[PDB]
Amino acid sequence: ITGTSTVGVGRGVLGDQKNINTTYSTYYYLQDNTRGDGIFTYDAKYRTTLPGSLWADADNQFFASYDAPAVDAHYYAGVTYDYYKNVHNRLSYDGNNAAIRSSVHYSQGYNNAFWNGSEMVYGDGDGQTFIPLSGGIDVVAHELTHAVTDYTAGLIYQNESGAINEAISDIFGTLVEFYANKNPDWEIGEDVYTPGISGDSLRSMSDPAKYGDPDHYSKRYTGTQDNGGVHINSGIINKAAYLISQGGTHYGVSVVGIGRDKLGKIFYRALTQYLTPTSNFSQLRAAAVQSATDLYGSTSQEVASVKQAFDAVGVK
Numbered sequence: 079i080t081g082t083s084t085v086g087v088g089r090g091v092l093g094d095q096k097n098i099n100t101t102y103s104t105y106y107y108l109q110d111n112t113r114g115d116g117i118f119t120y121d122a123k124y125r126t127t128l129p130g131s132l133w134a135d136a137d138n139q140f141f142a143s144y145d146a147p148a149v150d151a152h153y154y155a156g157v158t159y160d161y162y163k164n165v166h167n168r169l170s171y172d173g174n175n176a177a178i179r180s181s182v183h184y185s186q187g188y189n190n191a192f193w194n195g196s197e198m199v200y201g202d203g204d205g206q207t208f209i210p211l212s213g214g215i216d217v218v219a220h221e222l223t224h225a226v227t228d229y230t231a232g233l234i235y236q237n238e239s240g241a242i243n244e245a246i247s248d249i250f251g252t253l254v255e256f257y258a259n260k261n262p263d264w265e266i267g268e269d270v271y272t273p274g275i276s277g278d279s280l281r282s283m284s285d286p287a288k289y290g291d292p293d294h295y296s297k298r299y300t301g302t303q304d305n306g307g308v309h310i311n312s313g314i315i316n317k318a319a320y321l322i323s324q325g326g327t328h329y330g331v332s333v334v335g336i337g338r339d340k341l342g343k344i345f346y347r348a349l350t351q352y353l354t355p356t357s358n359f360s361q362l363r364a365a366a367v368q369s370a371t372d373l374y375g376s377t378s379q380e381v382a383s384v385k386q387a388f389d390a391v392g393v394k
C-alpha cells in the first residue's frame with residue numbers, strides 16, 4: 079500500500095507490549111517501510127488460501143487477542159531482518175532487500191509454521207500442543223533462515239542435506255534469540271510449545287537426546303520417515319554447533335568453546351560460500367573447517383575447535 083509510515087503499539091502472544099512499524103492510508107496496515115522493500119503481514123482468517131488480506135486496523139493499537147500473532151509475526155520478522163543486516167551484512171533473504179511477507183491465523187488449530195518458498199505461514203496451534211507459533215522468536219528466525227538457505231546453498235529437503243538445512247535453521251534461529259536477548263537458550267520452540275508444561279521444548283541443541291534425537295553419527299536415523307530424518311538427524315549437527323560455541327566433552331572428546339559470534343560467522347560463511355544443494359555431513363565439516371580457516375588461519379584455536387566438535391559427534 080502507498081501511505082505514510084508510522085508507529086503503532088500492540089501486545090504479542092505472550093502478553094508483552096511492543097511498538098511496531100505500520101503504514102497509514104485510511105486504515106493503519108501492518109506494512110513496515112523501514113526495512114528493505116518492506117515487511118508485510120497478512121490475515122489468512124482461518125483459511126488455507128494465501129496470503130490472505132494485508133492486515134488493516136482502524137486505530138493503530140493492536141491489543142485484541144486476534145491481533146497478537148500478527149503483532150509478533152511482524153515484529154520478529156523485523157528483528158530477524160536486523161540480525162542478518164547488522165551481523166552478516168545481508169539485506170533480506172535474497173541479499174537484495176526482497177519484501178518479507180507473513181500470513182497468520184492460517185487454517186484452524188494448525189500446529190506448525192513454515193516458509194513455503196515465497197512467504198512465512200503461521201498456524202495458531204490447537205491451544206494445547208502449541209499457542210500461536212509467531213510468539214516464538216526462534217521459530218520465526220528458524221523459518222526465515224530457510225529462505226536464506228534457499229537463495230544460497232539451496233540444500234535439498236531430504237536425507238543428510240535436509241538435516242543440515244534444518245540444523246542451520248536451528249542455529250541461526252538460536253543466534254537471533256540471543257541477539258534479541260529474549261531470555262535466550264539453546265532449546266527450540268520453548269516459548270510456544272505446550273503452554274501447560276514448563277521447561278520443555280521441541281528440540282534441544284545442547285542435549286538432543288533429551289527428546290530422543292541422535293547426538294552422534296552412529297545413532298543417526300536411517301529409515302524413510304520425515305524425508306529421511308531431516309528433523310531427527312539435525313540433532314547431530316546441532317550438538318556440534320553447541321559444542322563449537324560453548325565447549326564441553328562429548329563421548330570422551332573435549333571441545334574448547336569459541337563462542338556464539340564466531341559460531342555464526344563460521345556457519346554463515348560455510349552456508350553462503352561452500353555448501354551446495356546435495357552437501358552431506360562430511361562435506362559440512364569440510365566447509366566449516368575451510369570457513370574457519372579463511373577467517374582465523376589454519377593453525378587457529380577456532381579451526382581446532384571445529385574439528386574436535388565434528389569428531390565428538392562422529393562426523394568425519
Ligand SMILES: [Ca+2]
Pocket residue numbers: 135136137138139140141
Ligand atoms: Ca486496533
Ligand SMILES: [Ca+2]
Pocket residue numbers: 255260261262263268269
Ligand atoms: Ca528462550
Ligand SMILES: [Ca+2]
Pocket residue numbers: 216252255262263264265266267268
Ligand atoms: Ca529457544
Ligand SMILES: [Ca+2]
Pocket residue numbers: 268271272273274275276277278279
Ligand atoms: Ca511447554
Ligand SMILES: [Zn+2]
Pocket residue numbers: 220221224243244247
Ligand atoms: Zn525447518
